[PDB]
Structure formats: structure tokens, C-alpha cells
Design a protein around this ligand. Structure first.
Ligand SMILES: C[N+](C)(C)CCCC(=O)O
Ligand SMILES: C[N+](C)(C)CCCC(=O)O
Ligand SMILES: C[N+](C)(C)CCCC(=O)O
Ligand SMILES: C[N+](C)(C)CCCC(=O)O
Ligand SMILES: C[N+](C)(C)CCCC(=O)O
Ligand SMILES: C[N+](C)(C)CCCC(=O)O
Lengths: 496, 496, 496
């Protein structure tokens, strides 16, 4: 069970150097950060939207295409169509998603798009529609093209696939893919992916620690955000070093149910009728503004909206793009290309749309109640403090806050455990899929990830987080397109 | 020729009790009325829109579906494709439609949607588009699914169908349909339908009596609106008690022609060029605002627009839904599922679109002329007074007003004659279709209907009218869905 | 090589009389002009939009229709699919297009549509989108129906076609088409076409002479605009009287390359990033406003926008409609109906969109720089003066202005040479296609065309130009429809 170096070291080095250089000087890093962010987005952000817009076109090409009816492997599907869907529905709930779900509608209102007056009933009607855009069917649809390529590689070519290059053979020649070309590709990929995993952890953390501080009293400090990234890593090490994963799967489920439960709670207490009317009104907005939004760059007013939200989000999506499609691919053996397009979108969107319309209309009602001053809270304490204030403003606050705490807790564990497996896996040679990798390489990464998060938690602000991501997405833009093209050259000749 | 009691009495009783309870105390009723209206619409109005939205989706499923090419019975179609269409075109003209057609554009402008400044060129450009939405293809389309089910029941299953339950066997078992389940269903149905029939009569009446007052001088009073509901009933009794229906069909035609004639008059005098430019400009609005409107609930501004117009309409549509689909079904034997979807929509919309856009641009021009003060007219006299003032503001006023008067007149007769047949019919056992029912049961209902109308004419305002309807639509929401589902279970196994 | 009189004289006479009557009194003509313009557009302009809307529908009927896969002649296509496309791409660049491309975005901002505040960031974001509408795929698409009819006449019926009537046989009987019916048709056609050709020349001219004045110093006067219309005609006469056309084709190419070159220049110097972001943002606008715009008549605010821009442009399109479709038809032998629809649109739009988004974002940036006062320039000197100021505001102004000068120059030559051939051609009997017509009839027309242009250059303003066109478009409305219907009757029976 080797530790291939061409895919182990370049990551580790690069993450360390940059992570180090950043800890050295925070003030200066932040200046660099803000330089990068603004460049990429203001100069290039349009290419991101066009990416998503193409991928969308081709969800259609898949659905009304020639490979439309093609079956994804001969065998029958090893899941009940309902089990399958629920499996998608249940993947979507991350720690970090609770973060955005809870706050993003606020900024949508605070500083709106399309030159809208803030906190205007108008920027409010439009608030949730923008959620439904950024986490709607429209974005999920883009995944279907790679979800089908990985599906087809997996079963129609019975290919073994661990890293991005291992699919590239047809596009570039077994020569270059086995070579360094594929090694650079697998490295850029990994590095980008690492940052993402970290920034995700960085969102998760303050939610967990602000919760503790709320229930307990323990000041949310940095020496405490890092305390808990180590617990996570320790706790991780223990679970994996004990082959305890059997029970980790059982906790993951406890997580899914808790989150439906919670979402369900926030729904009924906050006022379904409203939520329904608001969700409805919102769908028509989405439907009518969709095209405007798909391509929004606000080039005259130069308000940052598209760049800071869409272009930031689109790019996060471009990163996690492969990790999911691979997952959508496995849970989906033996279905038809079209079966899958219609399924993943219907499924996932159900999940995403519920969340963001529940939490958002909660935190929106809170806004029209003046229960809490969200802006003054963010100002003096930081985003997460506010987020928790919007959960705690709820009836039976203490219990409600226990649910969230646990939820965020067991969720982040899941997350960590997950990043480590996948990371260790793409960095070890001669390892069968479904097999547990070397404990040292595994827990090893979990520390490097947890290290990234604090460095971002340290740098302070969201600008680090989003630069991290926007940067990440830049290589993956072409990685993704590459895999996609690869999948195409190799089905033009074999599928038929 | 029996009088089945399970479908005769529960109606009669319930209509009487409620009608009685309402006459007892008007002030208090109106308080109840306004309570119901606001509850249903503000809490539930969204589910109505979703209803229509689904049914729409499924006009597509019909058109690009599997039953797409299926023929609706083996025999050829007993109508010229042009006769057919004209038959649809000719059905749309009711008394009450003249009412809405004439006034509704005013309120759109007076109090507009989307936070628009009133009487702003802007709320004006959008005025007619909102007509074209509310009576466009989009709403007709929804009927196609039930129009096909009744078509299929009628011919592909050679089933005999008089009341909603008689279709339900497949969904619920011959047991329950024959039973009381189907009896409750047929009762809610009827009761709802009665109220509608009445409120329609309540719209018609003041148009007829305000016309009289204009031509003659006879004060439009309540003791006079009721005089005329009795004439209608008397006149009805005579026509039916004489088997005179042969000539009623001839008068119905005189009606259709008179209304094309009128519409045509108003068109050319008022200024075609404009009407064309306006109609055009309006179509694009409709086309671009369509999605916004489909789902509009105005949940932040809480202006009543969607709830008071759309939700009120939509629900009227859900009531008359079955009565028409059955009619579209019969006039349409031997056509293809798709032949019918494309036809009814094309046909009907032609009819509806012309009307509104004519009467509305008339009454719109009147508005930009300050010929008359519509608002002050409504204030001191009631809506209908204004409506008539917009007809009489026309050239050759007196003749013009004769045309309308007659039109409204012979039209309402038609209406009454119609409600009575249908009502008596769904309330008598062992009666073949196409056959004249018992004169007592027939004329009997015509009095109960005419009774409802005055009670509403009595209660004063539109709020009674729209509550009536919005209430009606509530059961029929599920009745309609039920029939629809029934039609589906039973084609999944028999059509093939 | 005869000079058929039925198609030579009525033109010549009519153009002369009207041209004469206009020179007699300019002040009065202009009063007539402005009378016509406002009548046609305000009363009828809607019918133009409807025209374009139908033809669009039927690009779909072609694409998803029955003639979808039909091949346009048996033989294979005598062009490389890339040669083909480039041939379309290369046709679009006229002199007159440089004019509109350069200025039109200004007025879109100066006086905007949809009740927009002028020079508002808002009327600006929407500026270019309106370009993308007026010269987008949407307008090209309308040509495909006639492009296919001429294609089919040419190869599927091996018919010989010189004038509009020669296609009409099936619609009207060889009797009437050979007759005068077809002679009136061919006359209205021609006359309309002449004016267009002229007004095009009238746009070209002041661009050429304002360039001279910029590089040289020679005052742009009227006695100079006419100097150069005679040079063009002289220069024309020489080239054609020498059978020199071999080298004219070579100069035409030099033109295409120069214009790509120029467009490319303006692109990179002005700031691609922006241009990209702006082009993007603009596509979404187009996509979302599309329906509103398709049918815009602004009937309440009665701002002239639709009538003065769309209805004017639409009508220009209705004239050149046949001349192009015939050309698209020839360059396209042996392709499939659908091959063509997808091809012409993709092709042409590529061309048009690039132009107008480059020149317009240049002239837009100039606006937000206050480099030049475009309004005050138009006021004291006339449109063209401004246009040139926006080219000359560019880096390396003098060379830049040489490129444009040459471009406009060799372009207008091409134009003139072209109008003369075609005109002489449709006015001479017994002349094979591909054959050079009589030098007297040829150069003869070039003087009559150049005469029209000055008469317009004389009358001053754009109102003459656009009335010219709008008037032209009126017969061609039905000519076009006629050809189209003819093509239909004759494929219903022969293609199969
Ligand atoms: C700062 N942040 C990320 C909370 C919102 C930024 C919105 C924008 O880019 O204009
Ligand atoms: C980037 N993120 C986490 C907001 C969404 C990534 C897509 C996914 O969750 O599968
Ligand atoms: C008053 N009425 C019923 C005629 C119009 C109501 C408009 C609304 O729903 O707010
Ligand atoms: C309810 N109403 C009258 C507005 C439309 C009912 C449909 C129909 O008349 O067939
Ligand atoms: C005058 N012109 C042609 C430059 C712009 C006219 C715009 C309009 O018709 O309102
Ligand atoms: C009207 N015009 C000349 C600007 C466009 C004519 C269509 C074409 O370029 O073929």
C-alpha cells in the first residue's frame, strides 16, 4: 500500500509554504488575498458564468441527446429508486451550508443587486429568489455531465478511477496521463481541493464554537477555534485508527435526520403559510430573472454583487464538481443517462431549496421583527455570532440550540473523516476502491486541512475564504472541462 | 324519472340554511364573508396558483405525451374542424364576462401590481397584459387535462357520466363511488356549483338593470334587481314548460352574433391602430411577466393584488372546470388528444383575448380622456353604473346601449335556462343524457339560484361574490384532481 | 441582350419624378416626409413587428418541420462548411453598418426605452443589449424562410429566377406572373429597392467625406458629398467598362480583412475584459427583455423609441430580405433545410454581434470618459461628424483613421458596383445569370442611385433616410409574403 510521491509531496509542500508564508504576516497576506480576489473576479468572473451556462446547455444535450436512453452499465440498479433519491437528499447537508443558508439572504437585502434600494420591500421579495438561483436545479444540472462521464467510465468502460488523470488517456494518450501532464493535473486538482476542504472547515468551526459560547459561556476565541480543530483531528484519528467507521455511518444518518428535524422545526414555528406564499412568489422571480442572473456582471454600476456572490459561488461549485459527480455516479449504477439527469436535479434541489427557504425566511422574519440588529452584531462580533442569534431567537431556544450544536458537531466530524479518506486516497498508489488507506497518511492530511482552516480563521473575514475558493476553481475550470472532453472523445468511438 | 334524494336534498337544505342565515343579518354576514375571504386567500391562495401551474405542465404531458396521438373514440368527428372551433369561440360569451371585461383593467391601473404607481403610464402599459394573463391561453390550457379525461371516459370507455362520482370507480372502487363517498363528492360539487351559478347571475343582473335605467329612467334598486330575477325565472318556466327549447337555441345564436357585432363596433370606433399597437405591446408584457405572475403572492408589501384577483379568479376557474371539460369533450368526439389541446386553447383564447382587449382599451381610452370619472361613479353608485357609462360614452350611444341591453338580456336567459337543466340533471336519477328532466325539479332550481344572486346583490359589494367563489373552489380543488387521477389510473390499464 | 421596358421604365420615371419633385422644394418635401414616417409607423408599425415574429416562428417550422432533413438539390455542396460560413461572415460588412454600429448605442442611452432615465447607468447596461436584439440571431432567422424558398426554387425545381414574379407562377398562375400583375410586383419591388440602395449610399457618403476632412482638412460640404458620388460612379463606369471585375473581387476581400482588422484593433485597445463582461451582461438582458422588445410599441407614454428604431429597422430588413435570401441560397447549394437555418444564423450573427459590441462599447466608453461631447457635436455638425470623432479618439488616431477611410472607401465602391449589376440585371430581358449586363443600363442606374443619395443628403437629417426605407418596406411586406406563400403552394405538391 504505497504512498505515491508525485501526488503526495507537491501538495504537502505547496500547502505548507503558502500556509507558512501566510502565518508569517497576516496583514500583508490579506492585502495579497484582496488583490487576487478582485483581479480574478473583476477580470475573469464572466468566464465562470459562461462555464455554468455551457454545462447547462449540455444537461439538455444529455437529456434530449443520443446517449439519452443509453443505460449506465448492463446490470440492474442496486438501489430502490426511492432509496437512491433519499441518498442524494441526504448528502447535501454540510456544516458550511447551514452557514450560508442562514445569512446570505441578509446581504441580499442589505446590499441588493440590480441597483435596488436596501431593505426595501423590493430587495426583500427578491432575496430568497436569489437563494433559489444559487442553489437551484440550475446549478445541480451542471453536474450531470460529469456525473454521466464518471458513470460511463465506471461501468460502460469498467475503468478504475482514483484521480482525474486516470480518465484522461483518450484525450491525451496513455503516454501523457500516466506521465507528468497527468501528475500536474492531479496536483493542481488536489491543492485546489485541499483549500476548499479547509475553507469549508473554517465556516463550520465558528458555528460550532459560537454555539458552545451560547449554551455554555466559553468565549469564542481563536485559541479555542483551534482547540476544536485538534479535537476533531484527535477524534478523527481515534475513529479511523479503531476501524470504527462502522458506527460513523450510523452517526452520519443521525445527522441527516436531525437536520430534517431541525429544518422541519424552523418551518412550522416560523409560519408555514408565509413560507409557502414566500416560496411561491420567489419561484416566479427566479423564473423571470433567471436569464438576467445567469449572466450578471454589473459592469456599469460596478457594484460587486455578481463577482462577490455568483462568481465566488460558481467557482466553489467548479471545485467540488468532480468529487460529487463521482458519488452521483456510484449510487447510480445501471440507470439511463436521462434517468440520472432528471433524478439528480429533482433530488438534490429538493434538498437545497428546502433548507435555504426555511432558514432564509426565518432570518428574514427576524429582520422585519427587529428582534435583533444583525448588522451591529456582525460589526462587533463577526458573521457567525449573528447566525447563532437567529437560531436562538427561536422558541425553546436552549433545546433548539442543542439541536444545532449537535448537528454542526456530528456533521463536521463526518466532514473531516471524509476529507481525510478522500485525500489520503488520491495520494496513495496501488489502493483498491472501497479500501481503507494508511492511517498515517490519512490522519496526516486531517492535520494539514485543520491547519488551513485556522489560517483562514486567523486571517479574519470572508475575503480569505472566497479568495481561497475562487483561486481553487481556476485550474479546475480546465480540469473539469478536460475530464468532460475526455469522456466525449472516448464515447464517440466506444458507446455507439 | 326519479329525483334521487342523496343528490337533491343536501344541496337544497344547505343552500337554504346558509341563504337564510345570511338574509337574517346582512351586516354580520358580511363580517363573516370578509373573514373567510381573507383567510383562504392569504393563507392558502398559493396552492391555487400551484394547481393551475401543474395542470399547465400536464397540457404539455398531453401534447408531447404518450396519449398524444391517441384518438378520442373510433368514429370520425361529427363536426367540421371550423364548425368545431366556432362552437368554442361562441360558448365564451357570458353576461358576467361583459362585466369583468369592461371594468377590470381600471383596477389594474387604479391599484396596480408589483408596487406600481397608479394611473402611471407604467401601470397602464401593464393593464391589458394582466387581462391577457387571466384569460389567456395559459388558463384554458388547464382544462385540456379534464377535457381529455371526459373525452376518454365518454368514448374510449363508452362510459355514461352525469355526476363527478360516476367517473371515480377506478380510483376508489365501484363500492365507494356508488356509495356515500361519491355522494359527498357529488354534493360538495353541486353546492359549490350552485353558488357560482348564482354569483354569475348577481353580476349579470345590475348590468341588465343599469341598462334599463339608462335607456328608460327606471331607478336601479334592489326591489328591481329581484323583480327581474323573477321574470327570468318566469320566462324560464314558460320556455321549458312549453318544450320551446327549439327556439332558445336560435336566440342563443342571435346572442353570439350580437356580441361579435358589438365587440366589432367598439373595436373600429375606438381606433384599431391603437388597439393593435396596444394589443401587441401587451403580448410582450405577458410574455415577459408571465412567470412572475404565474406565482405572484406579494408577500412583503402585502398588497392584496394576487389574492384579490388571481386567487379569486383561479378559484372561479376550478369550479366551472368540470362543466366545460365535459362540453369540450362532447363537441370533440373522434379527435386526437393533441388535436384537442391545440384546438381548445387556440379557439377559446381567440374568443377571450378579443373581448377584453376591446372593452378594456375602450374603458382605458375613456380613462385617458377624462370623459368620465369612473372612481367617483363607482363610489356613489356601484361598479355596474360605471360599466354602463363606459358603453354609453360611445358614439350612437342609445343604439349602442340597446345592443348591450339585448345582449345582456338574451344572454342571461340562456344562462338561467342552462343552470337549471344542468342542476336538475345532476340531481335526478335514471335520466338519459340529452333528455329533458322533470319541469318541477328544473324550474325549482332556477328559483334557488335566483335567490342566491339577490342575497349577494343584497349583501352589497364584490366581496360576497368573490368569497362565494373562493369558498366554492375549495372542495373542487380536490374534486377536479380526483377526476383527473381517476382518469389516469384507468388509462394506465385500458388505453395502451 | 434586351432592355425589357415593363421593368425598366416605371422605375426610372417614378424615381425621377419623385426625386425631381423633392429637389424642387426641400422644406416642403421634409414636411411630407415627416408626415409619411409618423403615419406609417404610428398607425402600422405593429404589423411590421408581427411580420418578423411570424417568420421567426417558421424558422422553427423549418428546423423541426417536415422539410427539416430535405436536401437543397441532389449534388454535393460546392463549398467547405468553413468556406461557406466565412462567406456569410464576410458579406455583412457594409459602409452603412459602420454608421449605425458606431452611433446607435448613443441614442439608446441619450433617449432610452421603457421609460428609462437617460445616461443612467441603467439605460447604459441596456444599451448594447438593444444592439444585440436589432442585429442578433433573431432577425437573421427571419431570412431563412426565404433563403430556403430561393434555395428550393433554384435547385429542387431547377427554376431560373431573376425577378420576384418569376417565382409566383404557382401562387397566381403562369398567366398573371408573366402578365402585369407580376410586372407591378417587380416594379414596386425595384422602386423600393432603389431607394434603399440610395439611402445606404447616403449613410456611407458623409462617413467617407468626414474622414477626408479629418485627415486632410477639406470641408465636408454638400457640393463635396456630390463630388464623391460622381467619382464613385465614374470609378464604377471604368471598372465595369473594362471588364475589370476580376480585381474588384480582390479588393472586396481586402475590405473584409481590413474590417476584421479594424474591429480587432478597437477591441483590444479599448479593453477586452470590459467588452467581455459587457457582452456577457448584455446577452442576459437580451434574453430576458427579448419578448418585451419583440412586440414593443410604447402606446401609453408615446415615446417614439419602437417606431423610430425597431419599426424603421424591421422595414429596412423587409427590403434587403429577398436580395440576401437569394445569396444565401446560392452559396448554399446541396445542404439540408436545417443545415441552412442553423448555419446562416450562427454565421451572420457572429459577424453582426461582434461589430456592434465592439464599436458600441468604444463609443460607450468615450461617453463615460467625457473625452468628447457627442450631443454638441451632433448638434452643430451632424451625426457623421461625431461618429468620426469616436474613431479618432482612438490611439494612433491618424493611422486608425486611414484604416477606416480606406475601409469605407473600397467598401462603398463594392456597394455601388453591386447595386448597378443587380439593378441593371433585374431590368434587362433575356439575360443569363452570372452574365455581365449592358454597360449603358448598368452605369445608367449607378447615376440614378447616386442621385437619390444626394437628394437625401440634401434634405438633411435621418428622417428622410428612414422614411425612404419605411416607405420601401410597405410593398415588400406583401412581396416577401407572396414569394413565401408561392414557395409553399409549390412544395406542398412537388417536394414530398
Ligand atoms: C462582503 N460579502 C462577501 C459579505 C458580500 C460581498 C458582496 C459583493 O461582492 O458586493
Ligand atoms: C461549494 N458548496 C459547498 C457551497 C457547494 C458545493 C456543491 C456540493 O455541496 O455538492
Ligand atoms: C376590491 N376588489 C375586490 C374589486 C379588488 C380587490 C383588489 C385586491 O385583491 O386587493
Ligand atoms: C369563471 N369565468 C366566467 C370567469 C370563466 C369560466 C370559464 C367559462 O366561462 O367557461
Ligand atoms: C431621431 N433619431 C432617429 C436619431 C432618433 C429617433 C428616436 C425616436 O424615434 O424617438
Ligand atoms: C438594413 N441593413 C442594411 C442595415 C441590414 C440589411 C440586412 C443585411 O445586412 O443583409
Amino acid at each position: 500500500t504505497g504512498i505515491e510521491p508525485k501526488v503526495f509531496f507537491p501538495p504537502l509542500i505547496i500547502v505548507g509554504i503558502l500556509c507558512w508564508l501566510t502565518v508569517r504576516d497576516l496583514d500583508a497576506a490579506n492585502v495579497v488575498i484582496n488583490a487576487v480576489f478582485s483581479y480574478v473576479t473583476n477580470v475573469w468572473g464572466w468566464a465562470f458564468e459562461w462555464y455554468m451556462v455551457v454545462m447547462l446547455f449540455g444537461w439538455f444535450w444529455l437529456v434530449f441527446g443520443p446517449y439519452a436512453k443509453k443505460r449506465l452499465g448492463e446490470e440492474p440498479p442496486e438501489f430502490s429508486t426511492a432509496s437512491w433519491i433519499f441518498m442524494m437528499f441526504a448528502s447535501c447537508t454540510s456544516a458550511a451550508v447551514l452557514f450560508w443558508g442562514s445569512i446570505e439572504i441578509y446581504y441580499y437585502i442589505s446590499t441588493p443587486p440590480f441597483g435596488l434600494e436596501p431593505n426595501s420591500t423590493g430587495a426583500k421579495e427578491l432575496g430568497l429568489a436569489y437563494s433559489l438561483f444559487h442553489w437551484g436545479p440550475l446549478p445541480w444540472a451542471t453536474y450531470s455531465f460529469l456525473s454521466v462521464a464518471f458513470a460511463y467510465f465506471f461501468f460502460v468502460r469498467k475503468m478504475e478511477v482514483i484521480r482525474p488523470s486516470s480518465t484522461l488517456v483518450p484525450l491525451v494518450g496513455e503516454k501523457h496521463a500516466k506521465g507528468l501532464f497527468g501528475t500536474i493535473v492531479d496536483n493542481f486538482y488536489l491543492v485546489a481541493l485541499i483549500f476548499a476542504m479547509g475553507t469549508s472547515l473554517g465556516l463550520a468551526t465558528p458555528l460550532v464554537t459560537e454555539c458552545m459560547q451560547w449554551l455554555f459561556g466559553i468565549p469564542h476565541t481563536l485559541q479555542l477555534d483551534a482547540i476544536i480543530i485538534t479535537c476533531w483531528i484527535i477524534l478523527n484519528a481515534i475513529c479511523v485508527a479503531c476501524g470504527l467507521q462502522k458506527a460513523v455511518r450510523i452517526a452520519s444518518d443521525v445527522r441527516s435526520y436531525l437536520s430534517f428535524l431541525m429544518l422541519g422545526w424552523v418551518f412550522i414555528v416560523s409560519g408555514a403559510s408565509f413560507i409557502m406564499n414566500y416560496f411561491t412568489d420567489s419561484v416566479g422571480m427566479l423564473l423571470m430573472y433567471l436569464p438576467r442572473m445567469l449572466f450578471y456582471t454589473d459592469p456599469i454600476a460596478k457594484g460587486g454583487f455578481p463577482q462577490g456572490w455568483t462568481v465566488f459561488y460558481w467557482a466553489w461549485w467548479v471545485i467540488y464538481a468532480i468529487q460529487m459527480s463521482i458519488f452521483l455516479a456510484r449510487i447510480s449504477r445501471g440507470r439511463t443517462v436521462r434517468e440520472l439527469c432528471f433524478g439528480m436535479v429533482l433530488g438534490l434541489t429538493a434538498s437545497t431549496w428546502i433548507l435555504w427557504t426555511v432558514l432564509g425566511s426565518n432570518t428574514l422574519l427576524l429582520i422585519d421583527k427587529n428582534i435583533l440588529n444583525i448588522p451591529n452584531l456582525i460589526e462587533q462580533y463577526g458573521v457567525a455570532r449573528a447566525i447563532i442569534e437567529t437560531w436562538a431567537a427561536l422558541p425553546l431556544s436552549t433545546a433548539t440550540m442543542w439541536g444545532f450544536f449537535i448537528l454542526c458537531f456530528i456533521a463536521t466530524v463526518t466532514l473531516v473523516n471524509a476529507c481525510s479518506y478522500t485525500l489520503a486516497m488520491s495520494t496513495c498508489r496501488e489502493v483498491r476502491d472501497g479500501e481503507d488507506p494508511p492511517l498515517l497518511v490519512r490522519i496526516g492530511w486531517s492535520i494539514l486541512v485543520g491547519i488551513i482552516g485556522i489560517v483562514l480563521l486567523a486571517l479574519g473575514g470572508l475575503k480569505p475564504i472566497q479568495t481561497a475558493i475562487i483561486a481553487g476553481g481556476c485550474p479546475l475550470f480546465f480540469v473539469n472541462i478536460m475530464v468532460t472532453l475526455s469522456f466525449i472523445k472516448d464515447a464517440k468511438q466506444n458507446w455507439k
